[PDB]
Short mmCIF file of C-alpha atoms in Angstrom, two decimals:
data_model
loop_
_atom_site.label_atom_id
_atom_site.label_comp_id
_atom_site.label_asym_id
_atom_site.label_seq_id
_atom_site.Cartn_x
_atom_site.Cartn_y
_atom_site.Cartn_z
CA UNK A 1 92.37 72.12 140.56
CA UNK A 2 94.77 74.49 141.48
CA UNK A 3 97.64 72.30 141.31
CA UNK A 4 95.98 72.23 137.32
CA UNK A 5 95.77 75.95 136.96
CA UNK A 6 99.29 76.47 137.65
CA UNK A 7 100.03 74.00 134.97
CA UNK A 8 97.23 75.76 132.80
CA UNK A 9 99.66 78.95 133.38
CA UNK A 10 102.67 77.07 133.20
CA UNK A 11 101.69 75.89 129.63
CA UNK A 12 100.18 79.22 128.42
CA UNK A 13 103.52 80.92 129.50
CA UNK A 14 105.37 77.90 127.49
CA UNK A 15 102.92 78.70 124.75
CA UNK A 16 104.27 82.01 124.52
CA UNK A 17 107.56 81.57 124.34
CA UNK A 18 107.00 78.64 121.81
CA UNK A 19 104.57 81.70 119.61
CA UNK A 20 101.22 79.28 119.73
CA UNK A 21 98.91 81.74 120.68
CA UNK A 22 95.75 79.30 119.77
CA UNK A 23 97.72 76.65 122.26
CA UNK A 24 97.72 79.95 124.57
CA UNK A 25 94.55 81.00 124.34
CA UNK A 26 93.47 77.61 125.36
CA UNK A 27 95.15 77.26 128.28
CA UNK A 28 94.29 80.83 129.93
CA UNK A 29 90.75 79.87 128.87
CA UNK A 30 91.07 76.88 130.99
CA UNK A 31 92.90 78.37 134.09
CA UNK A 32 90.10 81.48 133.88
CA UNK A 33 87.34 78.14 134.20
CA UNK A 34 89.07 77.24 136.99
CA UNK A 35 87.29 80.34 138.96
CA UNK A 36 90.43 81.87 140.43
CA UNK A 37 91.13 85.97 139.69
CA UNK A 38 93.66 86.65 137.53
CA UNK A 39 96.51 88.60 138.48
CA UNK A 40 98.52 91.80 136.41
CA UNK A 41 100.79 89.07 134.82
CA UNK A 42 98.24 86.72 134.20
CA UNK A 43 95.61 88.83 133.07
CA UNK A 44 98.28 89.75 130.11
CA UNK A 45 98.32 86.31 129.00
CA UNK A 46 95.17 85.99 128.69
CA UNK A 47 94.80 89.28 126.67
CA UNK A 48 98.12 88.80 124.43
CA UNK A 49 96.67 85.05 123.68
CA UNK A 50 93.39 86.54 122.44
CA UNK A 51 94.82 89.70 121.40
CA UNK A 52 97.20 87.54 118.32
CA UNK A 53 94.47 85.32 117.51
CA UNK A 54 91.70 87.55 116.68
CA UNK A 55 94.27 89.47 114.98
CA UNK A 56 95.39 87.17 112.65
CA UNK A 57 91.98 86.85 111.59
CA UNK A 58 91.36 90.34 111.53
CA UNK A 59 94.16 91.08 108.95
CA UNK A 60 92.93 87.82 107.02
CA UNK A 61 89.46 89.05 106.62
CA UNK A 62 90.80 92.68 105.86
CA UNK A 63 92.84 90.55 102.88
CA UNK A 64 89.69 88.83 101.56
CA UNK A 65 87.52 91.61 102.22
CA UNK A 66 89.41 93.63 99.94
CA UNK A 67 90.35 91.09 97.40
CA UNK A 68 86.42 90.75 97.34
CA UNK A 69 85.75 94.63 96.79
CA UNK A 70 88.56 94.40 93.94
CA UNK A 71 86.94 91.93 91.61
CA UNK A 72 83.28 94.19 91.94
CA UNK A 73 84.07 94.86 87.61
CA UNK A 74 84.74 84.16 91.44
CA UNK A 75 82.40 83.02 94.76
CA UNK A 76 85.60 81.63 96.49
CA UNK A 77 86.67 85.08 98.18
CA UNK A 78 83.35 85.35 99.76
CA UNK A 79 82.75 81.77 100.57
CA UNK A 80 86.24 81.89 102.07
CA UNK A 81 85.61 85.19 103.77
CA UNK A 82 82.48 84.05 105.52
CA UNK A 83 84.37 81.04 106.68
CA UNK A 84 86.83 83.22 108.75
CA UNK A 85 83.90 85.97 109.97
CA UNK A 86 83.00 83.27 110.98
CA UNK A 87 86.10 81.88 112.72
CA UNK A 88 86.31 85.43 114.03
CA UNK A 89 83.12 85.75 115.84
CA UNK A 90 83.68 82.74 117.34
CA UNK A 91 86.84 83.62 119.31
CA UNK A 92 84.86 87.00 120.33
CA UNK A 93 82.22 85.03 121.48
CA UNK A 94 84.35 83.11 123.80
CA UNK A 95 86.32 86.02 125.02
CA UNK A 96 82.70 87.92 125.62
CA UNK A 97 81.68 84.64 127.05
CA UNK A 98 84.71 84.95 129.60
CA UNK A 99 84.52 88.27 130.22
CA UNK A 100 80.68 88.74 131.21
CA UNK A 101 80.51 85.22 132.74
CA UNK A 102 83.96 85.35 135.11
CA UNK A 103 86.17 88.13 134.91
CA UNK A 104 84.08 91.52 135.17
CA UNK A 105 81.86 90.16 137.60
CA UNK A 106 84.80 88.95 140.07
CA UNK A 107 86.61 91.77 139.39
CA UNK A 108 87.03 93.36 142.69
CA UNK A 109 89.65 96.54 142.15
CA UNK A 110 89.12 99.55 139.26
CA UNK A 111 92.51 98.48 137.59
CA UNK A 112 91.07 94.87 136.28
CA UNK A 113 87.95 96.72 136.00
CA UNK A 114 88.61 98.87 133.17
CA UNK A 115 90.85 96.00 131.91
CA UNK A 116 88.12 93.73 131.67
CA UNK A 117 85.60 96.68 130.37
CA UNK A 118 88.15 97.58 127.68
CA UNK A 119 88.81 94.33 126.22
CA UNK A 120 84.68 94.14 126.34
CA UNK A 121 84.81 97.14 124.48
CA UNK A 122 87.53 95.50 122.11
CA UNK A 123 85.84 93.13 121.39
CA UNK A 124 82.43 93.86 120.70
CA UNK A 125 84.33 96.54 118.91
CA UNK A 126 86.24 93.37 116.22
CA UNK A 127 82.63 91.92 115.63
CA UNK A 128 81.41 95.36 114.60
CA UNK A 129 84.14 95.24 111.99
CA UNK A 130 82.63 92.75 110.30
CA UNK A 131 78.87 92.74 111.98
CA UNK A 132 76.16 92.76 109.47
CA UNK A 133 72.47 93.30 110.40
CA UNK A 134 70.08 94.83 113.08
CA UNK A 135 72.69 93.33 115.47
CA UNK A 136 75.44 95.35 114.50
CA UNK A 137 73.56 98.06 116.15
CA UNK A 138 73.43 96.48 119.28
CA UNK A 139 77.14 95.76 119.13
CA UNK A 140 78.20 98.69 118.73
CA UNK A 141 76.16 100.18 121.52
CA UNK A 142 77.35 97.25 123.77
CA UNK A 143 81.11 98.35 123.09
CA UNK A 144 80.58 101.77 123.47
CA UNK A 145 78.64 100.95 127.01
CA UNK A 146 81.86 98.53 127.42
CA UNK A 147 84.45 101.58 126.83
CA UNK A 148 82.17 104.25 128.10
CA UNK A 149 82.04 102.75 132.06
CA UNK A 150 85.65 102.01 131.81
CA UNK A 151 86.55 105.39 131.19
CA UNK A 152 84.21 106.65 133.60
CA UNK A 153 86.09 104.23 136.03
CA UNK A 154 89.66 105.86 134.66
CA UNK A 155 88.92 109.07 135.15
CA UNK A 156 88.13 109.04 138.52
CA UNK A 157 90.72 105.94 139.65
CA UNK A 158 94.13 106.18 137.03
CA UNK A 159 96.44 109.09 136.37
CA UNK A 160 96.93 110.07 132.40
CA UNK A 161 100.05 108.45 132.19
CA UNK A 162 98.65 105.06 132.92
CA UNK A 163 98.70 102.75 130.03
CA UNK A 164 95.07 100.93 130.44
CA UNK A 165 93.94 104.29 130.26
CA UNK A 166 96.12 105.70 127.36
CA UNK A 167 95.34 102.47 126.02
CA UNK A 168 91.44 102.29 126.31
CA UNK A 169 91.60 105.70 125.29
CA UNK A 170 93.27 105.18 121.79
CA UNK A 171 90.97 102.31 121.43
CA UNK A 172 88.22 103.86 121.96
CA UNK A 173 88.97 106.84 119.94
CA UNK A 174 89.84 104.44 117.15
CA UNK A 175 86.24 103.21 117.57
CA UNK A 176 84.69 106.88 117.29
CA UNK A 177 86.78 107.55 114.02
CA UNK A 178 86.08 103.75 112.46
CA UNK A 179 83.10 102.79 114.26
CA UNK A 180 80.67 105.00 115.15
CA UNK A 181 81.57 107.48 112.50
CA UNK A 182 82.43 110.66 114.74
CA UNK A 183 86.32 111.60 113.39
CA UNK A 184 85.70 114.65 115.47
CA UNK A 185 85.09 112.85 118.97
CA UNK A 186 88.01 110.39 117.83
CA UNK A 187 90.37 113.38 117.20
CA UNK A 188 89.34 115.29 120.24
CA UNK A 189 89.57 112.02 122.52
CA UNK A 190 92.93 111.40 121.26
CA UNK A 191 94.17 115.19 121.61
CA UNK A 192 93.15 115.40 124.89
CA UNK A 193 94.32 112.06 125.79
CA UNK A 194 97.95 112.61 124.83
CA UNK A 195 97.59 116.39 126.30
CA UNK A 196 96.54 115.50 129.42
CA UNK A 197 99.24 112.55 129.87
CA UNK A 198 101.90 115.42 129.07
CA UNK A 199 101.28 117.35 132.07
CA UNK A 200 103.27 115.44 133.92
CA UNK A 201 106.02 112.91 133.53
CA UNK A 202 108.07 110.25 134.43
CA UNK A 203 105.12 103.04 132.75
CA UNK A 204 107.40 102.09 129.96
CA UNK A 205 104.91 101.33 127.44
CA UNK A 206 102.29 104.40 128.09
CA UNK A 207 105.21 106.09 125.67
CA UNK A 208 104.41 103.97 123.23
CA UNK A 209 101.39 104.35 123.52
CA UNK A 210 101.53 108.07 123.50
CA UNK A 211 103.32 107.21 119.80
CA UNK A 212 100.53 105.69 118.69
CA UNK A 213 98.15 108.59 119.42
CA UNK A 214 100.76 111.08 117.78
CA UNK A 215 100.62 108.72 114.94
CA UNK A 216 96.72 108.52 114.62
CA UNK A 217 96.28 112.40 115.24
CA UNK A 218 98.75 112.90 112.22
CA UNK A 219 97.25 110.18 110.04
CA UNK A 220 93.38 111.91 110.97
CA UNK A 221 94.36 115.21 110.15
CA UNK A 222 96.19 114.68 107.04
CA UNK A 223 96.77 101.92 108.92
CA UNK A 224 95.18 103.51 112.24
CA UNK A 225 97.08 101.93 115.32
CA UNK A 226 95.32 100.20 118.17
CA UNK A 227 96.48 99.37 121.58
CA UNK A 228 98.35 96.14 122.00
CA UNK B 1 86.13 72.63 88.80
CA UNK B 2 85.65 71.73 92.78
CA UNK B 3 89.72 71.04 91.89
CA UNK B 4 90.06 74.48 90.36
CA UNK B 5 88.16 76.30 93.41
CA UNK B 6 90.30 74.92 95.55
CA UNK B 7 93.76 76.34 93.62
CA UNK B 8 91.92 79.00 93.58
CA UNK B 9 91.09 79.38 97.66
CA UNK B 10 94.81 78.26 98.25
CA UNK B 11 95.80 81.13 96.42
CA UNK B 12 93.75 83.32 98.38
CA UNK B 13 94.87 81.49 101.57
CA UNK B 14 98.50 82.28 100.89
CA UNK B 15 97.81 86.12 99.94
CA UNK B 16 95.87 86.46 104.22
CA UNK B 17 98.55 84.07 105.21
CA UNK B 18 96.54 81.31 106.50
CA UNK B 19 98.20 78.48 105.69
CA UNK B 20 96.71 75.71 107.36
CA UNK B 21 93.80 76.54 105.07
CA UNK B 22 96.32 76.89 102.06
CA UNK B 23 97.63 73.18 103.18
CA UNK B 24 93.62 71.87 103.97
CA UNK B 25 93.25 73.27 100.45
CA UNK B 26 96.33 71.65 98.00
CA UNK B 27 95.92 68.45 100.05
CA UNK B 28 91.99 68.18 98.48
CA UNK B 29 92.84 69.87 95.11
CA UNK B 30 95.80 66.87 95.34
CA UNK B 31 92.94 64.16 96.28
CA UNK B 32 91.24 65.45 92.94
CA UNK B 33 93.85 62.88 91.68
CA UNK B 34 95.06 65.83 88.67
CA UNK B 35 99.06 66.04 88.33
CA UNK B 36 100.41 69.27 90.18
CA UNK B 37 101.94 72.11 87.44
CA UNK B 38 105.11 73.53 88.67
CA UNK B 39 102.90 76.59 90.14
CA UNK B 40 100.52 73.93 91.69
CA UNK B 41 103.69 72.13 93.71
CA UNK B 42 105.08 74.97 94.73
CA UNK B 43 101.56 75.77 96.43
CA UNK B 44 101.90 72.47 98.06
CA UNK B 45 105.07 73.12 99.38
CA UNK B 46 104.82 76.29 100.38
CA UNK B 47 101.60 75.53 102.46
CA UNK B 48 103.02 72.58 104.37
CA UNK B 49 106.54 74.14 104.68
CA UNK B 50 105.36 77.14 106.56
CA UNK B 51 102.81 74.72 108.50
CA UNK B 52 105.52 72.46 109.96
CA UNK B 53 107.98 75.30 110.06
CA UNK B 54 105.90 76.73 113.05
CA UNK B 55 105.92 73.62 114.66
CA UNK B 56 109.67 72.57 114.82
CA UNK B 57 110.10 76.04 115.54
CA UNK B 58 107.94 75.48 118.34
CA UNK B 59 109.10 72.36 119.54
CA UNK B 60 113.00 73.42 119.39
CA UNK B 61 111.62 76.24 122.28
CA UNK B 62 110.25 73.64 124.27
CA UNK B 63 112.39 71.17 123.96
CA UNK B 64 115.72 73.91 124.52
CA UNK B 65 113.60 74.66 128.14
CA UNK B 66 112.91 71.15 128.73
CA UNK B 67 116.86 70.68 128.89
CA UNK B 68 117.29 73.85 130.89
CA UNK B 69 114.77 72.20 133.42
CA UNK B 70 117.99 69.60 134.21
CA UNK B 71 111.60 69.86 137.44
CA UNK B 72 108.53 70.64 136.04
CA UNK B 73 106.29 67.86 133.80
CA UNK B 74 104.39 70.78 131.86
CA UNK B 75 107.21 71.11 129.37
CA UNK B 76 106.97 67.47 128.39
CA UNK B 77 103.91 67.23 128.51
CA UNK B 78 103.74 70.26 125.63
CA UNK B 79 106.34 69.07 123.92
CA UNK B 80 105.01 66.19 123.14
CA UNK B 81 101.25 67.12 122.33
CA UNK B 82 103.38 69.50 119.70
CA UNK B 83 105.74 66.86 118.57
CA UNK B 84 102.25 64.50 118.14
CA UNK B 85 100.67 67.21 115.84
CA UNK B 86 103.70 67.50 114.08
CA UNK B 87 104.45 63.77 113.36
CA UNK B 88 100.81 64.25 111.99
CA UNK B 89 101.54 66.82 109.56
CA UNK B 90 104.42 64.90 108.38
CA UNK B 91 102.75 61.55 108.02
CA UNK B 92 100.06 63.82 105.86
CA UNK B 93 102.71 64.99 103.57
CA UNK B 94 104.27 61.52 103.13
CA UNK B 95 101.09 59.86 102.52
CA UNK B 96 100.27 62.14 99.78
CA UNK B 97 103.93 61.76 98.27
CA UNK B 98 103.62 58.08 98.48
CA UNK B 99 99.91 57.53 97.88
CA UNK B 100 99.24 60.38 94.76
CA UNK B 101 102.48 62.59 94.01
CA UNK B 102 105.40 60.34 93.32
CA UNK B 103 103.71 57.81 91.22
CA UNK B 104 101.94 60.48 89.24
CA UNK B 105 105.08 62.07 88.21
CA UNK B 106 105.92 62.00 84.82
CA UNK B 107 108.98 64.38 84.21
CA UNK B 108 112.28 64.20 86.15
CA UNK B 109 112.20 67.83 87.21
CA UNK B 110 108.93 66.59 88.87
CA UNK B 111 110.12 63.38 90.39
CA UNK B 112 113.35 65.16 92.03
CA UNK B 113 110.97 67.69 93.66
CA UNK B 114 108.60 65.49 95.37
CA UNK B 115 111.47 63.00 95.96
CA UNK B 116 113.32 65.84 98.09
CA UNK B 117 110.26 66.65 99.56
CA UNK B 118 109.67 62.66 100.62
CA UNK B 119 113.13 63.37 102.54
CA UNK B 120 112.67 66.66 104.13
CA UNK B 121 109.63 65.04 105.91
CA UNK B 122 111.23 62.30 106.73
CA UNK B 123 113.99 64.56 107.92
CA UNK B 124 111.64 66.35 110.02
CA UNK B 125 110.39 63.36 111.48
CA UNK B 126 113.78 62.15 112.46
CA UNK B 127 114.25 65.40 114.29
CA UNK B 128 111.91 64.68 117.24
CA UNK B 129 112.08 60.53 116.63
CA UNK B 130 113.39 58.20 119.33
CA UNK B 131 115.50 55.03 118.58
CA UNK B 132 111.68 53.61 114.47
CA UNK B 133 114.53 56.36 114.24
CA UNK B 134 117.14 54.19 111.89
CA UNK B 135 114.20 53.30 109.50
CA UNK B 136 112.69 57.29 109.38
CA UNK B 137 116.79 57.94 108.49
CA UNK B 138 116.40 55.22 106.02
CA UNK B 139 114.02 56.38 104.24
CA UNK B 140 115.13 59.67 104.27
CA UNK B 141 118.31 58.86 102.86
CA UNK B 142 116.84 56.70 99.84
CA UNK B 143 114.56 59.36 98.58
CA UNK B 144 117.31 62.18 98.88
CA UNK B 145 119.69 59.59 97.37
CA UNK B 146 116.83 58.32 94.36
CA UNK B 147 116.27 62.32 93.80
CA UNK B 148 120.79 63.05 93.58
CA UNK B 149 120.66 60.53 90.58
CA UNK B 150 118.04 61.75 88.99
CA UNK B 151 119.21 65.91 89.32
CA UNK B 152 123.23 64.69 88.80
CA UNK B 153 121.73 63.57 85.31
CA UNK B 154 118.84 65.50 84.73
CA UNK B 155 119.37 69.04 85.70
CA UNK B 156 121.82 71.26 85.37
CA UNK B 157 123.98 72.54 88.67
CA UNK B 158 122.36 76.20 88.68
CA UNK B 159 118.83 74.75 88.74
CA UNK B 160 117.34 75.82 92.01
CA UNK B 161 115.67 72.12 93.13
CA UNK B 162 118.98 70.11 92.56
CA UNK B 163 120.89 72.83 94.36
CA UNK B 164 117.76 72.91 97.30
CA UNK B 165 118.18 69.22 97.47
CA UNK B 166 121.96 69.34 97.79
CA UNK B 167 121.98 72.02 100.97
CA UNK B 168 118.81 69.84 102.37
CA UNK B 169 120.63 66.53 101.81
CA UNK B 170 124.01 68.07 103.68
CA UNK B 171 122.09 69.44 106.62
CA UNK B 172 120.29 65.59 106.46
CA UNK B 173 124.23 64.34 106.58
CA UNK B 174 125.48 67.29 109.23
CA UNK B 175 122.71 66.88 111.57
CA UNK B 176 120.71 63.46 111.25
CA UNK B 177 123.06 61.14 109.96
CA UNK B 178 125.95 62.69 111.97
CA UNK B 179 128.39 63.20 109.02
CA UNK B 180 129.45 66.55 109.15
CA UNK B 181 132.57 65.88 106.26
CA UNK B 182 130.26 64.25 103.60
CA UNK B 183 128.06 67.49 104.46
CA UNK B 184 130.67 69.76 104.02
CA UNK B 185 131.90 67.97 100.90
CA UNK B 186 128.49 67.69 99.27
CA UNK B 187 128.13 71.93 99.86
CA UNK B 188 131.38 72.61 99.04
CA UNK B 189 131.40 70.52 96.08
CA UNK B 190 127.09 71.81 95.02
CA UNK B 191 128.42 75.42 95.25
CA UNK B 192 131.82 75.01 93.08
CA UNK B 193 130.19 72.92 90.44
CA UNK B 194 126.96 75.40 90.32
CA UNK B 195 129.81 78.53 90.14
CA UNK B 196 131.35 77.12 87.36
CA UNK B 197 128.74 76.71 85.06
CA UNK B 198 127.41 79.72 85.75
CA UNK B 199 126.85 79.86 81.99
CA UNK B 200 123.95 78.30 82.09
CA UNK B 201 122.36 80.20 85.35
CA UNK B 202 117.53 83.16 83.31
CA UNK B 203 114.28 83.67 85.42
CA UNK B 204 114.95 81.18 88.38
CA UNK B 205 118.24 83.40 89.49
CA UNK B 206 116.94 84.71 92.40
CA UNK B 207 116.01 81.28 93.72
CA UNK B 208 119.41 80.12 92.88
CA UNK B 209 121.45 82.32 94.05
CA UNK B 210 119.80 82.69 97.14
CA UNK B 211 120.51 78.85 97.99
CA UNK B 212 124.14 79.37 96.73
CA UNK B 213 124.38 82.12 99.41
CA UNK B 214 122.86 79.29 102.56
CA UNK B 215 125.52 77.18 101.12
CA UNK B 216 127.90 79.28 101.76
CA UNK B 217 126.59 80.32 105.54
CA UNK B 218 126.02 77.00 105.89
CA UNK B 219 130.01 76.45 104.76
CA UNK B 220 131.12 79.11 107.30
CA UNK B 221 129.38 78.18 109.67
CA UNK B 222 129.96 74.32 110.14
CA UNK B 223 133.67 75.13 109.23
CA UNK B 224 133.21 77.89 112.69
CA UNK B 225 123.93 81.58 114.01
CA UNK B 226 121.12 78.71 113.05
CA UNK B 227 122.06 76.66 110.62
CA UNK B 228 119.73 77.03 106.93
CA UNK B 229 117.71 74.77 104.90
CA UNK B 230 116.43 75.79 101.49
CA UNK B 231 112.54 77.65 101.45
#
């Protein structure tokens, strides 16, 4: 069982160089049933599996959705767009499914913590991109519950410069401006995100980070990034 | 009309990129039985090209690390379960070419295209096949060989499917059938002839000339980084 969870890892780190991120998914999926914690390195591969699936499906139902507001003035661009919703909330499912079943609850330190909380919060936050109904109230209050402990959990545990943080910030900024509808929260968020993480530096990819709020501050005042 | 949905959801498959779909999608509209117009083939092509593209892609990764290795059995063990899927997509593609496609085609500029495309999959298949591997050449080199007669008298040497079936058929002799002079000859000789009669190059320019240019990087580089194969 273990001797098949380092070959689960093996695989999903073969996966990765080979760019089959479905093939990747699966495998980190697998090694996560296997009960053991995940470790910084492994806990990556299980986010950058998910992370390129779900986006690849994201930016396909983006394409349809639009192609589908377009032609408002042919049932195959909804029937097709349904189809991959509903490929979509599948793979959140299962990630939600991993996340509230194994990984937050045997998540023993604050750095997995708010890992685990803000790829919650990611998530729930993808299906309320395309959530339709009563229950895309509920979603949205589950992601902001998601983000909302993690960065109570930040703020007290991680410096500014740390890149969950920077990280769940942005995203959860980008779910105030998109999401919830508060551009002002978003904005002030971000501002006092990237302000904050400026007094003092200096951990290679918080700058980039840092980019990415620069970017979305400029692009608020006057396509919004995410956190890888 | 199911046919016509179907064109029409491979078209929006192609546009979010999803081409598994986009293959899922020509394969059925094929099964319709209806001959493929030019923009229909290329559909075809295009979805199963970027499909099995992934997957040598992916298996040339594994398989570079599983000779790095010389232990771990992982690597195998992937490299196969992608080499399985792969032979799958291939034997797909041929049994539609064989089955529907190649009978159905009428025209020569038709029967060339789906004639190189019988031999690119073969060619694929002969890229991860062990020993089975002399028929898979075989056949390979028939249809490329059937599809040269046709395009020597058919088309003319600009026309972007003789001169994609030329640089495909050298990198079949370079790298499959281990002939790297009758591939160098066969480029050399595709490129000069296509330069000459430049003449009668229209609309299709930009696919032509951008095979003329992986002729010549293929040229330079089997003469002294990854070798190309037409789109």
């Amino acid at each position: 069982p273990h001797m098949e969870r380092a070959s689960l890892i093996q695989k999903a780190k073969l996966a990765e160089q080979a760019e089959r991120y479905e093939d990747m998914a699966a495998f980190m999926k697998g090694a996560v049933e296997k009960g053991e914690e995940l470790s910084c390195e492994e806990r990556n591969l299980l986010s950058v599996a998910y992370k390129n699936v779900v986006g690849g499906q994201r930016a396909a139902w983006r394409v349809l959705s639009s192609i589908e507001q377009k032609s408002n003035e042919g049932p195959e661009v909804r029937e097709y767009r349904e189809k991959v919703e509903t490929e979509l909330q599948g793979v959140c499912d299962t990630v939600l499914g991993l996340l509230d079943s194994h990984l937050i609850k045997e998540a023993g330190d604050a750095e997995s913590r708010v890992f685990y909380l803000k790829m919650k919060g990611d998530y729930y936050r993808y299906l309320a991109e395309v959530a339709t109904g009563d229950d895309k109230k509920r979603i949205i209050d589950s992601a902001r519950s998601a983000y909302q402990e993690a960065m109570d959990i930040s703020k007290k545990e991680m410096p500014p410069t740390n890149p969950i943080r920077l990280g769940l910030a942005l995203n959860f900024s980008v779910f105030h401006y998109e999401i919830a509808n508060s551009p002002e929260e978003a904005i002030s968020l971000a501002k006092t995100t990237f302000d904050e993480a400026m007094a003092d530096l200096h951990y290679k990819d918080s700058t980039l980070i840092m980019q990415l709020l620069r970017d979305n501050l400029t692009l608020w005042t006057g396509r919004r990034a995410s956190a890888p």
